[PDB]
Amino acid sequence: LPFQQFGRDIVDTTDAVRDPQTLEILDITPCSFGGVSVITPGTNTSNQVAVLYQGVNCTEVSVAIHADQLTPTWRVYSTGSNVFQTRAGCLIGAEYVNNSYECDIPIGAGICASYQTSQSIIAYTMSLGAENSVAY
Amino acid sequence: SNNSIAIPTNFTISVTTEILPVSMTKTSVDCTMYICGDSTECSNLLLQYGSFCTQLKRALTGIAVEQDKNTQEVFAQVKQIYKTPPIKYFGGFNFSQILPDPSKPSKRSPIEDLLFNKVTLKFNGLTVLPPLLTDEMIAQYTSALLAGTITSGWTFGAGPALQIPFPMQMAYRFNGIGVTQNVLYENQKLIANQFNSAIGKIQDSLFSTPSALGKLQDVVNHNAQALNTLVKQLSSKFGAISSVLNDILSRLDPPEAEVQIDRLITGRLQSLQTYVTQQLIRAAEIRASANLAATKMSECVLGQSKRVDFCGKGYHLMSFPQSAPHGVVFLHVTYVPAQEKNFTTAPAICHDGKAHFPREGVFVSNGTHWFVTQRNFYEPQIITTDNTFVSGNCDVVIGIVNNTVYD
Amino acid sequence: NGLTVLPPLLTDEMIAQYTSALLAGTITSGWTFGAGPALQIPFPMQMAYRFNGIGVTQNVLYENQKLIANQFNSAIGKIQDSLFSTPSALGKLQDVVNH
Amino acid sequence: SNNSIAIPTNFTISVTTEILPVSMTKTSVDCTMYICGDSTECSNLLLQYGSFCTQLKRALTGIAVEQDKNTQEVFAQVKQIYKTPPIKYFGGFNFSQIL
Amino acid sequence: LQTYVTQQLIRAAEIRASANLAATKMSECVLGQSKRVDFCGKGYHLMSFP
Ligand SMILES: *[C@@H]1O[C@H](CO)[C@@H](O[C@@H]2O[C@H](CO)[C@@H](O)[C@H](O)[C@H]2NC(C)=O)[C@H](O)[C@H]1NC(C)=O
Ligand SMILES: *[C@@H]1O[C@H](CO)[C@@H](O[C@@H]2O[C@H](CO)[C@@H](O)[C@H](O)[C@H]2NC(C)=O)[C@H](O)[C@H]1NC(C)=O
Ligand SMILES: *[C@@H]1O[C@H](CO)[C@@H](O[C@@H]2O[C@H](CO)[C@@H](O)[C@H](O)[C@H]2NC(C)=O)[C@H](O)[C@H]1NC(C)=O
Ligand SMILES: *[C@@H]1O[C@H](CO)[C@@H](O[C@@H]2O[C@H](CO)[C@@H](O)[C@H](O)[C@H]2NC(C)=O)[C@H](O)[C@H]1NC(C)=O
Ligand SMILES: *[C@@H]1O[C@H](CO)[C@@H](O)[C@H](O)[C@H]1NC(C)=O
Numbered sequence: 001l002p003f004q005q006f007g008r009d010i011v012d013t014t015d016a017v018r019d020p021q022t023l024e025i026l027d028i029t030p031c032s033f034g035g036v037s038v039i040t041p042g043t044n045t046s047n048q049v050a051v052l053y054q055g056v057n058c059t060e061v062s063v064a065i066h067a068d069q070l071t072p073t074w075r076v077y078s079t080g081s082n083v084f085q086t087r088a089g090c091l092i093g094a095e096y097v098n099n100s101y102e103c104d105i106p107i108g109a110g111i112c113a114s115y116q117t118s119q120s121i122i123a124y125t126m127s128l129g130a131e132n133s134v135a136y
Numbered sequence: 137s138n139n140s141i142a143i144p145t146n147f148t149i150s151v152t153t154e155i156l157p158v159s160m161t162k163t164s165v166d167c168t169m170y171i172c173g174d175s176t177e178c179s180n181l182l183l184q185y186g187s188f189c190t191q192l193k194r195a196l197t198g199i200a201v202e203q204d205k206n207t208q209e210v211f212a213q214v215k216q217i218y219k220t221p222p223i224k225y226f227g228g229f230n231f232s233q234i235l236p237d238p239s240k241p242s243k244r245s246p247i248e249d250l251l252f253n254k255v256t257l258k259f260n261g262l263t264v265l266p267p268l269l270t271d272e273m274i275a276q277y278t279s280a281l282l283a284g285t286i287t288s289g290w291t292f293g294a295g296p297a298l299q300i301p302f303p304m305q306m307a308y309r310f311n312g313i314g315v316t317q318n319v320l321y322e323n324q325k326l327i328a329n330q331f332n333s334a335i336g337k338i339q340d341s342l343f344s345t346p347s348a349l350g351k352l353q354d355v356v357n358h359n360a361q362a363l364n365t366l367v368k369q370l371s372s373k374f375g376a377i378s379s380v381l382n383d384i385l386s387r388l389d390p391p392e393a394e395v396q397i398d399r400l401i402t403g404r405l406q407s408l409q410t411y412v413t414q415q416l417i418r419a420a421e422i423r424a425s426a427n428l429a430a431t432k433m434s435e436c437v438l439g440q441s442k443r444v445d446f447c448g449k450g451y452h453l454m455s456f457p458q459s460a461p462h463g464v465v466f467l468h469v470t471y472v473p474a475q476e477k478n479f480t481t482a483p484a485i486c487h488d489g490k491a492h493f494p495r496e497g498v499f500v501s502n503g504t505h506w507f508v509t510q511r512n513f514y515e516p517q518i519i520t521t522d523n524t525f526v527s528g529n530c531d532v533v534i535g536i537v538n539n540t541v542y543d
Numbered sequence: 544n545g546l547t548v549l550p551p552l553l554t555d556e557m558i559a560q561y562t563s564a565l566l567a568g569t570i571t572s573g574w575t576f577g578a579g580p581a582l583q584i585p586f587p588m589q590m591a592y593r594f595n596g597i598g599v600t601q602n603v604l605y606e607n608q609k610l611i612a613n614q615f616n617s618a619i620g621k622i623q624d625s626l627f628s629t630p631s632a633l634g635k636l637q638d639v640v641n642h
Numbered sequence: 643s644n645n646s647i648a649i650p651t652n653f654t655i656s657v658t659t660e661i662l663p664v665s666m667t668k669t670s671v672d673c674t675m676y677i678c679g680d681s682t683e684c685s686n687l688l689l690q691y692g693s694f695c696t697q698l699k700r701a702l703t704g705i706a707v708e709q710d711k712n713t714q715e716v717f718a719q720v721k722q723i724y725k726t727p728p729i730k731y732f733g734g735f736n737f738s739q740i741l
Numbered sequence: 742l743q744t745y746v747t748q749q750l751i752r753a754a755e756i757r758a759s760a761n762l763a764a765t766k767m768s769e770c771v772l773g774q775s776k777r778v779d780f781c782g783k784g785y786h787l788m789s790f791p
């Protein structure tokens with residue numbers, strides 16, 4: 001209405017502001033944030049790791065990395081077929097296969113990771129078991 | 137009366153439901169973001185408080201892992217994924233409402249679809265983590281559990297799965313509650329119709345009643361309400377001059393803003409501790425419920441139970457699982473007697489000065505003739521030495537009635 | 544100072560009535576009233592069924608009826624003394640009140 | 643020994659007891675009365691503390707409702723109130739102490 | 742007040758566990774005959790009274 005200035009949500013956090021110069025309403029949104037998780041086999045095995053950025057689209061982390069706008073400074077090797085998108089977040093450092101094995105390291109919504117064969121880290125959709133059919 | 141008995145002459149097949157919560161939402165919290173948004177001074181002050189933030193993280197991580205353990209325990213009972221035969225003729229019994237439907241993209245039963253449509257329904261450093269098992273995988277587990285118990289009975293829960301036709305399995309299950317086999321073989325069509333109608337009524341009983349899934353609804357509502365309270369607690373003063381760190385620092389002298397910052401820090405830390413303790417207690421309750429659900433899955437779905445009123449009200453026959461959001465639904469099938477009648481009874485029979493007791497049944501009289509019957513379904517027989525034993529002379533027993541026993 | 548105690552919804556008489564109904568059902572019907580319509584049966588026959596349910600044939604009860612009834616009566620009789628003399632019997636309920 | 647067995651020749655009927663708690667006392671609390679008896683200044687100061695008092699009320703109300711649910715679950719098993727016959731002869735068994 | 746309420750919540754959870762056990766015992770020892778060892782007394786169960 002022609003007399004308000006701000007926009008307030010249910011929990012009373014501002015989420016819309018009108019520009020004072022020109023009367024235009026702008027929607028605001030917090031900058032991206034979340035946790036960071038590290039997937040590793042034993043240090044007795046090797047020293048390679050994979051990193052999961054939780055609940056973020058892969059393009060945003062790629063852009064922030066390319067413009068050095070991220071807080072934890074790893075800049076893990078990101079070129080090639082190692083950036084994968086999951087419902088849990090952006091997974092960097094493991095390649096996605098289309099086989100199905102038993103779950104080794106749980107990651108997210110039906111995705112696990114393991115150390116296979118040279119050697120590398122892979123991600124796959126977990127297998128519930130061997131299909132069977134009884135002769136009724 | 138001391139010489140009168142009642143024996144049923146007809147029965148009934150009934151189906152009831154049971155809803156049990158299994159798991160709740162997994163959340164994680166970041167202390168620095170929640171307490172001290174981006175100010176460096178607040179974080180530096182919070183450093184002189186110890187390990188009050190490692191403990192909250194550890195507690196929430198433990199809750200999150202237990203939430204997946206619960207679902208793994210309830211649903212991953214079986215080891216192999218069983219498939220149902222292409223043809224769906226099972227002696228006249230109809231299972232369409234509970235078996236997966238290929239036309240639906242998600243491969244869910246109609247009743248599972250009804251439940252899914254019925255329940256239904258990033259802050260400041262607060263996140264929500266997805267569960268490890270997607271809904272399709274839980275549906276696949278449920279489908280395997282249903283296919284195993286139709287084509288094999290209860291044998292697949294103790295070793296290799298051995299097939300058997302469905303009417304024979306039902307005959308075994310009648311035999312397991314004290315009713316002979318021939319009752320089912322002589323009332324097959326009627327019993328199948330009763331079962332079909334009982335399954336049919338479930339859709340209406342679930343759909344019309346709104347307050348059926350109150351437990352799952354409350355599970356969702358409490359978790360939403362706690363988070364809303366936690367976020368809206370961020371705008372309280374706790375005795376300070378303002379609720380914004382920037383406005384405190386802008387118009388105050390650095391050795392004087394410490395008091396206000398400390399007050400805000402203490403208030404917010406107390407709020408976090410309250411939230412975590414409440415979460416821990418709720419998690420313990422949910423774990424108890426999930427353990428009960430796992431026991432019911434083992435004992436009512438993979439076998440036949442003799443515990444009274446454990447798998448429904450009546451004499452248990454079998455049960456079927458269905459997957460619901462954050463929980464499970466059980467469909468218990470029981471046997472119920474009906475249409476009783478007066479009778480006169482006696483404890484023993486004297487013949488040639490020899491007492492007689494029935495091997496399996498109770499002596500009964502229709503006013504003129506004496507028979508022997510099984511004590512769950514009226515089916516008189518003729519007294520003979522092939523269904524009685526002697527064991528006694530004629531006189532110690534009280535209320536003995538003498539008649540003729542043939543050979 | 545601002546602290547109240549609320550009465551329970553069920554009075555003690557209603558709980559006593561529930562207990563009385565549970566006792567009357569299991570004497571004149573056995574276990575049949577917990578699964579459908581209640582079907583009557585004389586008490587010695589119900590006891591014969593219950594002996595049959597633990598691996599002892601029927602005729603034992605019919606030949607030892609009077610002795611078994613006396614044993615049951617005396618066993619019920621001793622309960623009053625065992626409960627009354629011992630003071631620490633209801634420790635659980637006492638602790639519930641005390642806490 | 644590998645060829646010897648023991649078999650009982652007489653029995654005994656015994657009665658034991660078991661006590662279990664079911665429900666506890668229901669209480670409610672008023673924040674303003676307890677914390678700030680009647681002073682207006684104290685209540686005004688307490689206003690700047692958030693929803694620390696709605697939560698306590700909700701928790702106590704939940705406990706109070708669960709206390710009634712417990713008693714309802716244990717005792718209201720049956721659906722009808724059964725009556726015992728006027729005569730109390732049950733084959734020689736005596737039930738006077740429990741009826 | 743907060744200490745009092747937390748203690749009450751824990752005690753209530755314990756009481757609820759006990760009441761669930763009591764309901765199961767009412768169902769299985771009073772409305773039927775039990776085969777579980779030492780559930781409805783020490784010996785071979787016959788019947789129970791509340
Ligand atoms: C046992 O009960 C069933 C169910 O009521 C009876 O079947 C009904 O019989 C009547 C009369 O023949 C029919 O009108 C109904 O349509 C039947 N019900 C169904 C669902 O088909 C059956 O007759 C009863 N058995 C005895 C011996 O009385
Ligand atoms: C099992 O029950 C379903 C539910 O009614 C039956 O589906 C019906 O099938 C007939 C054709 O025989 C259709 O005309 C109806 O419209 C269907 N009803 C619904 C709700 O879809 C099914 O036929 C039954 N199973 C068998 C083998 O007949
Ligand atoms: C089984 O035990 C009962 C109980 O001890 C025996 O009954 C007792 O018998 C003796 C001797 O006849 C009497 O002095 C007692 O008064 C009886 N007890 C009661 C309570 O009346 C019974 O004799 C035993 N049976 C056998 C075969 O030895
Ligand atoms: C059941 O036991 C009670 C308890 O003793 C019996 O009550 C006694 O009855 C006699 C009369 O037969 C009185 O002289 C006693 O004083 C009573 N005792 C008490 C403690 O009240 C009762 O008689 C027994 N049942 C039957 C049917 O005899
Ligand atoms: C403020 O100045 C700009 C500069 O041209 C003008 O376009 C705008 O209309 C002015 N705002 C108002 C409210 O007049």
Ligand SMILES: *[C@@H]1O[C@H](CO)[C@@H](O)[C@H](O)[C@H]1NC(C)=O
Nearest residue numbers: 056057058059060085086087
């Ligand atoms: C990520 O962003 C692109 C474009 O910004 C969008 O097309 C894509 O759907 C996003 N990822 C997901 C999982 O939605």
Ligand SMILES: *[C@@H]1O[C@H](CO)[C@@H](O)[C@H](O)[C@H]1NC(C)=O
Nearest residue numbers: 081095096097098099100123
């Ligand atoms: C894996 O194989 C499937 C065929 O079922 C194919 O659709 C998919 O693209 C493959 N994954 C690859 C090539 O990464």
Ligand SMILES: *[C@@H]1O[C@H](CO)[C@@H](O)[C@H](O)[C@H]1NC(C)=O
Nearest residue numbers: 137138139535727729730731
């Ligand atoms: C019990 O049986 C006797 C005969 O043995 C009979 O006279 C009496 O009426 C019966 N009791 C009842 C309540 O019918």
Ligand SMILES: *[C@@H]1O[C@H](CO)[C@@H](O)[C@H](O)[C@H]1NC(C)=O
Nearest residue numbers: 140141142475476477478479
């Ligand atoms: C059994 O006998 C009682 C006593 O006469 C009577 O009230 C009852 O109706 C009878 N049962 C049936 C099914 O008629």
Ligand SMILES: *[C@@H]1O[C@H](CO)[C@@H](O)[C@H](O)[C@H]1NC(C)=O
Nearest residue numbers: 501502503504505506507516
């Ligand atoms: C009892 O059953 C016999 C069966 O042989 C029958 O002849 C008789 O008429 C029946 N009596 C009554 C009262 O129904």
Ligand SMILES: *[C@@H]1O[C@H](CO)[C@@H](O)[C@H](O)[C@H]1NC(C)=O
Nearest residue numbers: 486488489530536537538539
């Ligand atoms: C058969 O029973 C009647 C009545 O109980 C009894 O009078 C008669 O003596 C009995 N028969 C014999 C051979 O004792």
Ligand SMILES: *[C@@H]1O[C@H](CO)[C@@H](O)[C@H](O)[C@H]1NC(C)=O
Nearest residue numbers: 643644645646647648649650
């Ligand atoms: C076991 O049986 C053998 C004969 O089969 C006998 O010699 C031996 O003494 C028995 N063992 C014991 C401990 O009595």
